[PDB]
Amino acid sequence: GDSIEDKNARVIELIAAYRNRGHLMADIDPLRLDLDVNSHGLTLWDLDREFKVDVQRKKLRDILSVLRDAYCRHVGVEYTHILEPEQQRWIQERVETKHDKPTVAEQKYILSKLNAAEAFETFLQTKYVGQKRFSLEGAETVIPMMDAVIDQCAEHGLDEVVIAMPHRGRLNVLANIVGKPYSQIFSEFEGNLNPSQAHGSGDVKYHLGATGTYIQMFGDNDIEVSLTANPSHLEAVDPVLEGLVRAKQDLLDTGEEGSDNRFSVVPLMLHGDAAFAGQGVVAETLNLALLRGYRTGGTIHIVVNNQIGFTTAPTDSRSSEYCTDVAKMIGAPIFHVNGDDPEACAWVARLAVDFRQAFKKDVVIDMLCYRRRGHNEGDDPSMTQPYMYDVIDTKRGSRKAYTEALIGRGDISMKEAEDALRDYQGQLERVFNEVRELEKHEIEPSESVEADQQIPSKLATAVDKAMLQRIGDAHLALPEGFTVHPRVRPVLEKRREMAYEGRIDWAFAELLALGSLIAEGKLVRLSGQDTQRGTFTQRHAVIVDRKTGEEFTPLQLLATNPDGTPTGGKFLVYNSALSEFAAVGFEYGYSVGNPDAMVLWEAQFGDFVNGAQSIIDEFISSGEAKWGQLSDVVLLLPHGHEGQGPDHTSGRIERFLQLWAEGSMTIAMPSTPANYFHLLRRHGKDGIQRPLIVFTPKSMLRNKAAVSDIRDFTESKFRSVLEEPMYTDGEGDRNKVTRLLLTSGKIYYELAARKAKENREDVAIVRIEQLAPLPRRRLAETLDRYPNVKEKFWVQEEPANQGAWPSFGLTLPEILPDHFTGLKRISRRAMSAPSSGSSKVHAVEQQEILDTAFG
Amino acid sequence: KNARVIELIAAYRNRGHLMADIDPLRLDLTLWDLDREFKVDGFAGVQRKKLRDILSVLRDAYCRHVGVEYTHILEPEQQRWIQERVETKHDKPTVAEQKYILSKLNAAEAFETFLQTKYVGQKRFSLEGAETVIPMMDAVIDQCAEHGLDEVVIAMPHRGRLNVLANIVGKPYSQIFSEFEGNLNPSQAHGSGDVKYHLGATGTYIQMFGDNDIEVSLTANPSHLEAVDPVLEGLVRAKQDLLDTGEEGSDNRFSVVPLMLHGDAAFAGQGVVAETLNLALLRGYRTGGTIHIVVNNQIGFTTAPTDSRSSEYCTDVAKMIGAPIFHVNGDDPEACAWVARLAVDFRQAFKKDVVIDMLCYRRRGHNEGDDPSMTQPYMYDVIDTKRGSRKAYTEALIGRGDISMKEAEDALRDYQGQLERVFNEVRELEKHEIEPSESVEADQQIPSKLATAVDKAMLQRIGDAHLALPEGFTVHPRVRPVLEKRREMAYEGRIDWAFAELLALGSLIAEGKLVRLSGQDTQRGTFTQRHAVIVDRKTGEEFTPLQLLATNPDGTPTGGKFLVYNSALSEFAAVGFEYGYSVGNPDAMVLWEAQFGDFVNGAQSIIDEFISSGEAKWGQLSDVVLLLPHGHEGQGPDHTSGRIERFLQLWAEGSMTIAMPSTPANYFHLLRRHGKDGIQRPLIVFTPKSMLRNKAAVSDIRDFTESKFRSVLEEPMYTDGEGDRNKVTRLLLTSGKIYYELAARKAKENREDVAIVRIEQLAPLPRRRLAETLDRYPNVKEKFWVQEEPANQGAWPSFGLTLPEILPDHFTGLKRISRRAMSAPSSGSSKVHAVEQQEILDTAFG
């Protein structure tokens, strides 16, 4: 036969090989540190021969040039892992073509960005040699690349770009991308802060955020740009950014829950190479990308891949070929780009935005670069990486190289290039001198943020009977032909009954609070593991048609007034992924993104929230004091000693009480359905943006004593301290009391039952419903009503090193010495675990506490 | 026609798995060219095959009960190896092998239906709908024994846990029934304990048809799904290092196999999965490949897969380390066993991870008291029509003529009758009184007067090792002074913190101990202080001075070794791995170092669920050391605190030792005590940063040769100098670096009326030594606990409450001197830190 047929078969193989594996041979590294193949008779003599390609006839030389330019020069394209053929086709059409050369104006603009990037760093090196700044030097191309992302988003008519990033070039991005004034950055280096800058305990300069407006230079549009605050914990901000963006999209009615699919707020997430591969929160956050409850229509990721992590080489930081391989699991295309090629970096940035817009999904840019100086500006890197730094020492920076290219192209002269650099440096010198001339302020110890947010003078949380009845009736206002599961129907009927007749249980009180907020126009977002039904089969926020699988959400009916007009409210209820770190981070972020939303995250059991410890420690408990960033997120933590073992017993009350300071969080363990209802309504309506930690029940959901009357919802309020009903409403005599038992949570009912059984008029039980801030005034006033008390005990089911005793045992006698001197503890022994593993052992220990309290 | 065939072969290999008949629920060119011959790359050379035959091979390999994902793998030899085994005829099992697979399905289902009958009201997380897990695991272990491997170590969650314990590991049925009965012997009832579906076991597996045996173990775990994953890897790595197999071994057998089970919702959602996979090829952590099994029942409690993950498969995360993925229909026992054996063979051939995604279903509710039709009515209507895998396989064998119905029933009734007999025997045992759980504190006790001092010759040897450079080695010019200073300190004293650490580890190595040290940038040290490894300035070659201590002066080995690594940028998986390693080799000295103590909260699940509580819950002992750089230096709220207060709150029952040493010699003695005491309990050390280079924080040679660990330290002026204790009216109790600032202030103002006492060991509290020290100051009228940490942090929250209760004649009236209570661990400003620090010093001497 004709050997052109064999040769053509090799050409088809070559095209497939460049598309699939060309990235492995691409010239992406600016440092350049690193017989049995059947050719089917194809050789260098066939370069001028025409071959069949799938439709079109082209020379081998031309096929090879297109493939080499697309896949083996300064851009390594990874996309053949993507399931959708239309997405592979979209990328092929855009990468397998001769690109239009940028205009001289565009080239000068890119150079102005590289000038600003390097000169900002060398200026800080000259003025503040002894201070850490985590310089971008060796990765200056990040600045024209981020400019190109934002400019392309503005071109698509998008509303906002929200950035999260680590330390690398942070100050540079704040000044040269977001627009944080140079004067402000210099004042941070000077340590000369005004009262607004010195507010709260604060944080380091490379953790701060900013907001501004990006104005296009080549078009008629502009776009909002924000950069969120973060702790040192690398990648921890990733789910926070997604939550922040989702809240903004929901507000704009764009995205998943919106009337249009614009997803008009873009998450722009930066990463370091060692952190992106090593931190599990990265995989957890990527796992949220296509979920109905969390999708943001695609995140644009940029890895500042300087092929080092402090002193650690990539071979000790990851097991994958690329630091970006984790992102392929959600079908993200990956673009590896040579950081010494500013034009390729800007081109990839615009392509990434276009892909995100076309398919509303994640895209990753792996910018290969290097770190000119040590990890921080005081560290010597040649001690551990002598070869890398011998190579770095021979390298001209990307600014110098790009300037030489423009001088060579005839675009600019050396004199013009020199003058432009001196002008920008002169501007920095002027601002530096102006800041240095400012009046120095006296340095004082940091101050508590407690008084910055206070409850409004007037706020009622009580609702009328009509509201309770409406929420009860909503549970039986089923869509026509809907088939309720036969074991769910009694719950719906019981809710209508409770709404009109009382004996309201915990699960219905929660829905009365959320339903009444929705009716008042509030957005309520509730999520967690199996949260739609409830772990304890108690919530049924969503019910499923037994015959069709169709879903009905009773509380959504409260978003429409009886006359048919919308209230402005909405109920967004989701089953989360099996994640704690990313889920809690997302809900924290969501509440920051929309301060007017009611946002609740529910742990399956409180015992699993330690999986989100970095978010609790670094954002929830401390973001207000450190950054002035406010969150109103609610954490619901099922808690209680029931004999189910050490991972089904405790939300670690003691840890949240230890973290507590400056009124940063509200911490509560309500004992009645009505008090929980009032707590949630207070939290949603007070205008205070501070997290709420609630220790919620499990068996107490179905305790027939733990029910509330209609008047507790219509004629009461949140009560931080509760007395026994026999003293406030009944015929109980407070003067007969000689022993006072102070407690919190479900053990109250067991203590009250024992009191009734033995007719102990000499013992009274007082509940502390709000654990923090301690209700000092209400507690003192309650105790003053018992003048004949001779002994006081703090009773708890938790071990002695757990529960409220570690905090209360120390704070109550100090804060109220005339009431709690001599306060003694009644609890389980101190334990390494939160409880015994045996239900029988739990029961014997529980009885010991009750016997000791009445002994 | 020819071009259509090569692209058709590539389509089946790359995407055939998307059309494979893998789900047991089933919830979701020209036609005249069939007899034409085409050239293909055969497994024994180029072949000419009919398109009809090419298509039948591709459909059987990639579109029946096995979905093969492998074309993401970079190595062409690995893709070829998989093709050779999947694109050829599979070995048909013998009748005896088929009967053996059926015996495993019988045990799997009958164990569950027996527990359903006897204990209807107790959770057991039944394997029903996934019984093929049992012959699958049997096949993995049997194939490992066929390769002559030493041990299989299993970690798994709740799904079929009791079933695996009884039918794979060999945990006695009498023991499992006693747990359901709640009638435990004193050993079973020891400590606070844990739920039955978290327990472990060990035994010996004997091949049914071959001539080998293999050890099989299953480790304990908390409820926290996937948290045990890095613990399993650490446990296996420690066992491999002991056997001289694997990464640091004389052979590349990696003869201890990690077998890691997962649930589908947990595998996709928990970040510790990606962190643990990321360790798989690292020199410090590699175990030569893990075999993963996902019991993929297409549900997570009430949650559908579309709400649990964003990837096509729950296993997609594993593709990042080039693991092949085998998706297999759980209703096909023979395909499940075949994939299991193929996975072992792949792991042995390439010493890398392999994933088996077993598609199955959950017959009952999430737990046996939950009603799943409320949220998944369609799935459970389909499940209600399904014949189980045991019934279906029995019908196949009866139809094949292998067995009769009578033989099938007799075999099932025999197993059930044996369960009934053991159940009756356990139920006949008298029930005794249930008591409150007891503290494990007295279970482990330090020997009387343990000597940790070393002689001058040992110190000198470790100093001299720093300049015993390999021939032609070029030391970096800024590293050479450190090596020279170490030789000087070894012979002349003024030993600093970093050298005291290396004197402790070096002397343990010389005594024959394995020392494993790792953490972020730990080879050099975050504060450029350690230099455990030095790099040749001209060639990049590495030299490890302490490795020289593994050889005696006469040339014989000591038996010791120094394994020092830079970790991945992980806290959760790294801490879990080091905990696991210490469990795997109790004789090893194992230390993990946080970059700053402020980042160890990233490993909170390991601290809470394994380190602080594993002894009380499971009787599992770990001697892992956590080194947490800590101290108020003005570097911000994430470069200041290891959260001492949290470790002291977690502390109970003597489960951990917690210390904040103030001198290099006291740290040396602490490490040597920990390595030589024969006690297996974690040690938490709050270590210094600026104090590494504080010229006052240096130790004398006699502190190493003639002393021991001191849990309480007095000022040198009273123990050795001419200081008068009777002049003291104010006592300052403290811990850590603030001692030096308090001592400097006392010397500057000549304050003979003030004494400073350090508590070096924070937990267990040194009650006797503290009381005896305070008794030496009879004229003290006021006592203060001084700390740089905020009032709600540091040792005050625990000491403020415990010291007046345990020593009332010494600490009644104890007052606090500290920073105010704070939401963050410190101010963000170095200038603000400095003003606050001066306030503490002024208050202490006010």
Ligand SMILES: CCOP(=O)(O)[C@@](O)(CCC(=O)O)[C@H]1SC(CCOP(=O)(O)OP(=O)(O)O)=C(C)N1Cc1cnc(C)nc1N
């Ligand atoms: C002295 C070492 O610690 P550190 O420098 O103080 C710091 O904490 C800095 C970040 C910060 O504090 O904001 C950082 S910088 C760094 C190396 C990062 O490498 P890569 O991701 O490749 O980024 P890069 O190459 O651009 O740097 C680690 C491990 N540090 C400590 C650290 C540990 N673990 C976690 C979760 N977060 C951290 N910040």
Ligand SMILES: CCOP(=O)(O)[C@@](O)(CCC(=O)O)[C@H]1SC(CCOP(=O)(O)OP(=O)(O)O)=C(C)N1Cc1cnc(C)nc1N
């Ligand atoms: C009542 C719900 O909580 P729970 O059942 O008590 C439990 O804690 C059980 C495990 C245990 O406690 O050991 C488990 S079972 C489960 C669903 C798992 O689904 P999948 O991975 O697909 O496995 P499966 O389908 O085989 O079940 C969750 C979320 N539970 C709570 C939980 C949450 N978060 C973490 C990190 N670990 C957990 N154990």
Ligand SMILES: [Mg+2]
């Ligand atoms: Mg890096």
Ligand SMILES: [Mg+2]
């Ligand atoms: Mg609020």
Ligand SMILES: [Mg+2]
């Ligand atoms: Mg599952």
Ligand SMILES: [Mg+2]
């Ligand atoms: Mg020990």
